mmCIF file of C-alpha atoms and ligand atoms in Angstrom:
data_model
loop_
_atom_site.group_PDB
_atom_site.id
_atom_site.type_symbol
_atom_site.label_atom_id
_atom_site.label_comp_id
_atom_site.label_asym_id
_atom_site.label_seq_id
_atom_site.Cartn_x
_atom_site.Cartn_y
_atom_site.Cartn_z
ATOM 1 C CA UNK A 354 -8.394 -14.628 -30.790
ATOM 2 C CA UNK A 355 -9.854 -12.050 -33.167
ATOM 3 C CA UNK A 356 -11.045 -8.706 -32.378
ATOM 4 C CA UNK A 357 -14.601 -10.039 -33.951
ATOM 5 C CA UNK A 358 -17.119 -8.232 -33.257
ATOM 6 C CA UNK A 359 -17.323 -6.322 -29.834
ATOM 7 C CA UNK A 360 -15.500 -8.784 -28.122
ATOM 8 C CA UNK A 361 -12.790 -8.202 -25.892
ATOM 9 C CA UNK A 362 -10.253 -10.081 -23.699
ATOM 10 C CA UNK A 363 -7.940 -9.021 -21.132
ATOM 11 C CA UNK A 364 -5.720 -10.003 -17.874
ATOM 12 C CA UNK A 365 -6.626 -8.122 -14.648
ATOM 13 C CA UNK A 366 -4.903 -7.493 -11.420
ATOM 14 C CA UNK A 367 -7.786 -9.124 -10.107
ATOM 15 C CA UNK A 368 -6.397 -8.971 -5.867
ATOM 16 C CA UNK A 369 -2.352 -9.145 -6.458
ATOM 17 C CA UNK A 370 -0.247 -6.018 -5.614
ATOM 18 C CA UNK A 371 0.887 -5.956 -9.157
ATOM 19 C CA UNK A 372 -0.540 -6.799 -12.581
ATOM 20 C CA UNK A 373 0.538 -9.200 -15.260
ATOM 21 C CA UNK A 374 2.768 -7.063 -18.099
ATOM 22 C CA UNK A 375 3.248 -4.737 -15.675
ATOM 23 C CA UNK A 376 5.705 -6.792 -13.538
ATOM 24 C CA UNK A 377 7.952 -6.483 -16.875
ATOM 25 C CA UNK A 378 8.924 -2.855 -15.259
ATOM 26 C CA UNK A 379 11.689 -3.944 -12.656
ATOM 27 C CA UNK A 380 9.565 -5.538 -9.925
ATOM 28 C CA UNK A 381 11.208 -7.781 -8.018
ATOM 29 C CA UNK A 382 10.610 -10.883 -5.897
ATOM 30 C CA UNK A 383 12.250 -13.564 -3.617
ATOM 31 C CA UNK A 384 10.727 -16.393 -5.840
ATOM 32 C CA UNK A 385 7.456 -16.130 -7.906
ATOM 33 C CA UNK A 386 5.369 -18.829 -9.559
ATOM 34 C CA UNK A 387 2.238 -18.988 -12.003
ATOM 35 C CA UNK A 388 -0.471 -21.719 -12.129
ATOM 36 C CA UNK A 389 -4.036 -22.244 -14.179
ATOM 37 C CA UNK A 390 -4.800 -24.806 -11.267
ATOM 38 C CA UNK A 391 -5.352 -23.125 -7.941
ATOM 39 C CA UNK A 392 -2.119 -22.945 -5.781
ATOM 40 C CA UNK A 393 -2.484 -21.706 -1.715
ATOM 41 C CA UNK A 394 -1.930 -18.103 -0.226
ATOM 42 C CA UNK A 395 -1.388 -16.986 -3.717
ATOM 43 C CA UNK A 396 -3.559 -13.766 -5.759
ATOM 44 C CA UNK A 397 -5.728 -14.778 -8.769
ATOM 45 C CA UNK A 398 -5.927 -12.618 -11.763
ATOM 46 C CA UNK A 399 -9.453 -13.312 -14.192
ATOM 47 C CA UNK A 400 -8.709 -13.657 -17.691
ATOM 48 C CA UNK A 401 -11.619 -11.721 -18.415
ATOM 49 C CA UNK A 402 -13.119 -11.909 -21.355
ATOM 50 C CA UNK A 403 -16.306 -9.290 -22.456
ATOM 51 C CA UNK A 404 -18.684 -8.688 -25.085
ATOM 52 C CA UNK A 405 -19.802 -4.894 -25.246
ATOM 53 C CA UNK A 406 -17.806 -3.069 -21.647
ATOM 54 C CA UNK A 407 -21.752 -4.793 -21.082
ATOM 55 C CA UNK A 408 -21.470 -8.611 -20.648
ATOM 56 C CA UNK A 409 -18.471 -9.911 -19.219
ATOM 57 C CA UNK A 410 -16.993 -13.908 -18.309
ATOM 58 C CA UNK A 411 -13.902 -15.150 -16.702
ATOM 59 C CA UNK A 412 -12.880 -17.281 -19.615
ATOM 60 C CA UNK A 413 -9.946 -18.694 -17.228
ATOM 61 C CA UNK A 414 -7.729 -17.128 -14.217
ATOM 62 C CA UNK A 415 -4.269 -17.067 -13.882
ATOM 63 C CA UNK A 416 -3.442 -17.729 -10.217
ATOM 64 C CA UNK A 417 0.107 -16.495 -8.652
ATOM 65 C CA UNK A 418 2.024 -16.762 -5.819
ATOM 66 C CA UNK A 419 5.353 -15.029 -4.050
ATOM 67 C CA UNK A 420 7.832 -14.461 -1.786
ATOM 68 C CA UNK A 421 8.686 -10.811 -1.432
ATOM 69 C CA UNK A 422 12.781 -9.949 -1.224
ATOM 70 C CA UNK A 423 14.884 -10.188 -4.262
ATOM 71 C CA UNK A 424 16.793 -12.165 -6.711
ATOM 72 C CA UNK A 425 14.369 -12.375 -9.056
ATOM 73 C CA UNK A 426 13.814 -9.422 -10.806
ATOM 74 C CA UNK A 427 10.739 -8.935 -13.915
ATOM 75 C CA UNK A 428 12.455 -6.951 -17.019
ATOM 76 C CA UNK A 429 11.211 -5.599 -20.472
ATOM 77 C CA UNK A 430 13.643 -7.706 -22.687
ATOM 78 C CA UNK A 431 16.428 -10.314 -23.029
ATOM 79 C CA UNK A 432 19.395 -10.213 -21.467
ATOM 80 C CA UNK A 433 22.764 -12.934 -21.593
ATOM 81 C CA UNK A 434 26.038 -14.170 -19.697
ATOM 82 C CA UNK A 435 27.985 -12.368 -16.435
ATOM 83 C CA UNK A 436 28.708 -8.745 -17.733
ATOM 84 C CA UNK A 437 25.326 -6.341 -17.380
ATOM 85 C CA UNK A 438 24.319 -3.488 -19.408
ATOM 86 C CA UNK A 439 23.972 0.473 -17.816
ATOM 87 C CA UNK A 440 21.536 2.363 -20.131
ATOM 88 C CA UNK A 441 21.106 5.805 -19.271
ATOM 89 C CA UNK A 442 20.273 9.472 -21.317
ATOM 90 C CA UNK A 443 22.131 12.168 -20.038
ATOM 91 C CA UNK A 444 20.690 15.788 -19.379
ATOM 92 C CA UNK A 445 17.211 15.310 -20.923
ATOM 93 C CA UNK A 446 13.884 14.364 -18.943
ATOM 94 C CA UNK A 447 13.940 10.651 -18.605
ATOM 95 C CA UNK A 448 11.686 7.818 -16.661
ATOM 96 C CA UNK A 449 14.489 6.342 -14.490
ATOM 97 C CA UNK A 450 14.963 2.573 -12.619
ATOM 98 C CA UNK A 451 18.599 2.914 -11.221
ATOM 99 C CA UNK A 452 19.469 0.015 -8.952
ATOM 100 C CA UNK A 453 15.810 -0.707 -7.708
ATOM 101 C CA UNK A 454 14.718 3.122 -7.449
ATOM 102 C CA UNK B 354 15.262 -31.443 8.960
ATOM 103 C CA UNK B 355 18.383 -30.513 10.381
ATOM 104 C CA UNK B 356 20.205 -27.025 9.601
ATOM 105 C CA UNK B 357 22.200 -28.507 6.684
ATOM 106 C CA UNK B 358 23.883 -25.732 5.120
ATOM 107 C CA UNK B 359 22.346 -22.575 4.373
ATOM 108 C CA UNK B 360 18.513 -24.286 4.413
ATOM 109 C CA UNK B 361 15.729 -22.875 6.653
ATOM 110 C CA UNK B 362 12.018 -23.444 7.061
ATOM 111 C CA UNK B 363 8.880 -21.768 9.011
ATOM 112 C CA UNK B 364 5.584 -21.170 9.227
ATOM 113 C CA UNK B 365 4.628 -17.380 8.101
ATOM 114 C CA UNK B 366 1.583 -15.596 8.656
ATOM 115 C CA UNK B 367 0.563 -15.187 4.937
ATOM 116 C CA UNK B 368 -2.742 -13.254 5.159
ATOM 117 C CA UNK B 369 -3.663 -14.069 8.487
ATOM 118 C CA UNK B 370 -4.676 -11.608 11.581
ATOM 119 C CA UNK B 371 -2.212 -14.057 13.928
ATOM 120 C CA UNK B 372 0.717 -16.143 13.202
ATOM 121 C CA UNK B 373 0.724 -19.582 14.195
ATOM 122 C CA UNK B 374 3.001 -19.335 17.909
ATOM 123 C CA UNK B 375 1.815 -16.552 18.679
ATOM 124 C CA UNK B 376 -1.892 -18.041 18.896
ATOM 125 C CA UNK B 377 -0.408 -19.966 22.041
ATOM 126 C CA UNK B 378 -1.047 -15.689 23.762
ATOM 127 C CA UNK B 379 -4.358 -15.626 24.786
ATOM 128 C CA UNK B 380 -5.756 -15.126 21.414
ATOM 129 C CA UNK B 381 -9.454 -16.156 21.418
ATOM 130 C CA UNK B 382 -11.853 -17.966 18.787
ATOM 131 C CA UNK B 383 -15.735 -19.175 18.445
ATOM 132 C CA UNK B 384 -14.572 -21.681 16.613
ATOM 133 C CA UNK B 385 -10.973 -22.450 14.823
ATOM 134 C CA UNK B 386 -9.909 -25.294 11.736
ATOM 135 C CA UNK B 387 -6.545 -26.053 10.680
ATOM 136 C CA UNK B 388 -5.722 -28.417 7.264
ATOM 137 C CA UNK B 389 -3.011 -29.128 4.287
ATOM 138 C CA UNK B 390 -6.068 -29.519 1.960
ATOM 139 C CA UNK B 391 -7.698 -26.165 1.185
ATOM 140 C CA UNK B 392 -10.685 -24.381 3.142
ATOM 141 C CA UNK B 393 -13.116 -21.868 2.412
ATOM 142 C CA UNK B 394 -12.940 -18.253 3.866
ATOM 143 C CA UNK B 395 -9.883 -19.599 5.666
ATOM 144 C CA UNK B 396 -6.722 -17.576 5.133
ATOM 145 C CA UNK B 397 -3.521 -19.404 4.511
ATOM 146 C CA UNK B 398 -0.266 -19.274 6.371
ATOM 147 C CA UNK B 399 2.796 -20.758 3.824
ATOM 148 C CA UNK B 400 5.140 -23.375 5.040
ATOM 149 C CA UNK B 401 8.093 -21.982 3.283
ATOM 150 C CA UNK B 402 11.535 -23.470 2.960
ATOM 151 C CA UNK B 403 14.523 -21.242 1.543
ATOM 152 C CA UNK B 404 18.192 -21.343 0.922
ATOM 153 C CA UNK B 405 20.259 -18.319 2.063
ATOM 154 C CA UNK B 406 17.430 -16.203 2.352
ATOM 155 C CA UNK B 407 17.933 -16.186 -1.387
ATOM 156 C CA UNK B 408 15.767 -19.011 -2.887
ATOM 157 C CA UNK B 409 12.504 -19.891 -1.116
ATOM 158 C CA UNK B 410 9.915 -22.743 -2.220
ATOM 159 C CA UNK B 411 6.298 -23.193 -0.471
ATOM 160 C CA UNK B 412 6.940 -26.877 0.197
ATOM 161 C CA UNK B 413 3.716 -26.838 1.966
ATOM 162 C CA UNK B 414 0.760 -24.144 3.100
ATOM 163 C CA UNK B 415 -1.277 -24.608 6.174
ATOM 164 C CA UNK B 416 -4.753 -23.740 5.849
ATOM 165 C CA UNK B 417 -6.577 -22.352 8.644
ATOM 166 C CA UNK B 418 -10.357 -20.775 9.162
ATOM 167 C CA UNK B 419 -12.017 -18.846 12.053
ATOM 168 C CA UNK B 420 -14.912 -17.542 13.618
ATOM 169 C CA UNK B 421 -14.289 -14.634 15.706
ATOM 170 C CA UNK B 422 -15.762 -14.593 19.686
ATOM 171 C CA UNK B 423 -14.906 -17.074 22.093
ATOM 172 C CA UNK B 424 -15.072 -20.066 24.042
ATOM 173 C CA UNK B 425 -11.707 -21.248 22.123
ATOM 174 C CA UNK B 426 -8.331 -19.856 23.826
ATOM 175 C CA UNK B 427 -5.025 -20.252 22.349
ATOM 176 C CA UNK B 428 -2.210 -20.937 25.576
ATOM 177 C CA UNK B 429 1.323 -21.421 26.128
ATOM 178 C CA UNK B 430 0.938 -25.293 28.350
ATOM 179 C CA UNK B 431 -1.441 -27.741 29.791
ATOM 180 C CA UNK B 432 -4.589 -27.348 31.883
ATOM 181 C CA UNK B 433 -6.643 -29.497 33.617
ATOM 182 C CA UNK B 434 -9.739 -30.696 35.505
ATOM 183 C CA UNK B 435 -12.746 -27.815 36.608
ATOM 184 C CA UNK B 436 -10.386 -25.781 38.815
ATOM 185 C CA UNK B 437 -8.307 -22.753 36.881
ATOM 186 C CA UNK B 438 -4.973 -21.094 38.054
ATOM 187 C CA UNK B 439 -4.666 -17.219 38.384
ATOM 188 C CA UNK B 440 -0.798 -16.320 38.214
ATOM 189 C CA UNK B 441 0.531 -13.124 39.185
ATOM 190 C CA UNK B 442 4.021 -11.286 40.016
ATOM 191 C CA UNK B 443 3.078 -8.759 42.319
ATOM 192 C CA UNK B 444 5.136 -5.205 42.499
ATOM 193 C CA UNK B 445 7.134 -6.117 39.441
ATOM 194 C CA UNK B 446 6.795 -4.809 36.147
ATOM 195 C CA UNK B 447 5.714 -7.576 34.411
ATOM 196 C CA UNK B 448 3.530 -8.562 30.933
ATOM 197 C CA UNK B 449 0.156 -9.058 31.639
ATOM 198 C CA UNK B 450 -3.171 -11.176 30.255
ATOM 199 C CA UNK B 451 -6.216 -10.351 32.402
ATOM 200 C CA UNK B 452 -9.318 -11.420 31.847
ATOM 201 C CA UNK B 453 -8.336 -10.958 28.091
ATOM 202 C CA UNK B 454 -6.824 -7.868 28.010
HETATM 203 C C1 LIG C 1 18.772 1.666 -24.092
HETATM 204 O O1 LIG C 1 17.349 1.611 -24.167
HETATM 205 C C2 LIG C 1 16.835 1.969 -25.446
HETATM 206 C C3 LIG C 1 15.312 1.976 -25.390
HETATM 207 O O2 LIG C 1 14.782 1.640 -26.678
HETATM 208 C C4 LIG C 1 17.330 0.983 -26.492
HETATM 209 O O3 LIG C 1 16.858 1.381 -27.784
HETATM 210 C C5 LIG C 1 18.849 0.937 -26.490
HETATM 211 O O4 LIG C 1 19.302 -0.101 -27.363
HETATM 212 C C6 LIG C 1 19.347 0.661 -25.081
HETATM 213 N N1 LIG C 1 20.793 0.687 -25.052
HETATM 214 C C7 LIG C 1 21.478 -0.372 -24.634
HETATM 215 C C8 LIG C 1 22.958 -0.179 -24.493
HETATM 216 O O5 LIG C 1 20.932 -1.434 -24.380
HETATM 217 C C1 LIG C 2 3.418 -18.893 36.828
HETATM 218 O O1 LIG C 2 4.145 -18.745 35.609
HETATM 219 C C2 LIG C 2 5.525 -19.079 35.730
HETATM 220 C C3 LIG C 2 6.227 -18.792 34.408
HETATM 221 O O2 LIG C 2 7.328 -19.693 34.243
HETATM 222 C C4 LIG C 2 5.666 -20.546 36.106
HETATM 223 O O3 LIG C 2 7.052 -20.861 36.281
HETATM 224 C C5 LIG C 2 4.904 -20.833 37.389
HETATM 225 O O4 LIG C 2 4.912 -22.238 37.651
HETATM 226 C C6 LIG C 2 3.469 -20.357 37.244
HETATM 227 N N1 LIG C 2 2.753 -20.558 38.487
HETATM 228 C C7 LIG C 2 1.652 -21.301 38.516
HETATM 229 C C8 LIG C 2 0.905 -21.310 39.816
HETATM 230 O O5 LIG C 2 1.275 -21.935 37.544
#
């Protein structure tokens, strides 16, 4: 869509312990899986869509569904083969994720 | 199924104030419903399968729904007829359901 006139549209967290985009930052689960058909013991997130902050419609949900544990692990970016990248910056104030922590 | 390599399966409590078992202890109802087609208000409790403890699927969900009170009791065995046991271990420390405490 278009940013046409006031209005907007947006994911929400809706009742999940996490939000969409936000699992990109290291989050991790035993298995996870997305639906736009309800599936059973699973969170639902509204796509919201508004006019104004003042009128506001659940255009569609996104419904998901996990196992806690690990395995599965929600990054920023890309990544390929066996060997794994470290990426750290050394002696200057830094926001950290170092094996899980 | 049988234990065929590293494959498990169970009920889990989901979102539920009990697990299914443990219902079997005393635990009390007005009224109690139990499907594998969704229910309203009912909390779900998934039927998970997994590999290793590393990979786990929801190859089913029971649905199940409540009204608090009584009248319903969850119990360990049979019962019968109008007449109703007491069982006690006297003078031995022992683990207790009295009157529904
Ligand atoms: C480390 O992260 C920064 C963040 O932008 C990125 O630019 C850089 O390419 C990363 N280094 C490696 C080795 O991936
Ligand atoms: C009391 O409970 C024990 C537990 O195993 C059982 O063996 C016994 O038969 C019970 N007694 C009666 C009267 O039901």
């Amino acid at each position: 869509y278009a940013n046409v006139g006031r209005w907007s549209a947006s994911i929400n967290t809706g009742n999940c312990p996490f939000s969409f985009g936000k699992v990109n930052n290291f989050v991790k689960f035993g298995s996870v899986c997305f639906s736009l058909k309800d599936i059973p013991g699973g969170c639902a997130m509204p796509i919201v869509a508004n006019w104004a902050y003042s009128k506001y419609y659940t255009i569609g949900t996104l419904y998901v569904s996990w196992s806690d544990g690990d395995g599965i692990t929600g990054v920023p970016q890309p990544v390929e083969g066996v060997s794994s990248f470290m990426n750290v910056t050394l002696d200057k104030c830094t926001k950290y994720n170092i094996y899980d922590v």
